Design a protein around this nucleic acid. Structure first.
Ligand SMILES: [Zn+2]
Ligand SMILES: [Zn+2]
Ligand SMILES: [Zn+2]
Length: 82
DNA sequence: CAAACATCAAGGGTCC
DNA sequence: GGGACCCTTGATGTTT
């Protein structure tokens, strides 16, 4: 696909609009905010996964028995138990 | 005092 | 560019 060069550390970052999330590791900037617990995050998806704590959600449902888990690895461990 | 094991967050990839 | 989920590595912690 496409690649970018980091202006700060000469790192090569793959992704069209993915450079700013890499820059935020250097600037230490967390533009996103949890409306409930007010904790701030550098990436929107990291806020979304945090929101699964408040809005109790288990998207990783088991394809075998239907049980659902909040984290993908808890599903993996349950699947390996079968 | 270590390994072993576990959980979970941080960076980057990859598709859509 | 923006969402979103996956994968790898590492910090931190508990149990040997
Ligand atoms: Zn950089
Ligand atoms: Zn919150
Ligand atoms: Zn199951």
């Amino acid at each position: 696909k496409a690649f970018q060069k980091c202006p700060i550390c000469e790192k090569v970052i793959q992704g069209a609009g993915k450079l700013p999330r890499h820059i935020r590791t250097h600037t230490g900037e967390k533009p996103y905010e949890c409306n409930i617990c007010k904790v701030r995050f550098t990436r929107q998806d990291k806020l979304k996964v945090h929101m699964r704590k408040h809005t109790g959600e288990k998207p990783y449902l088991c394809q075998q028995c239907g049980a659902a888990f909040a984290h993908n690895y808890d599903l993996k461990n349950h699947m390996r138990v079968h």
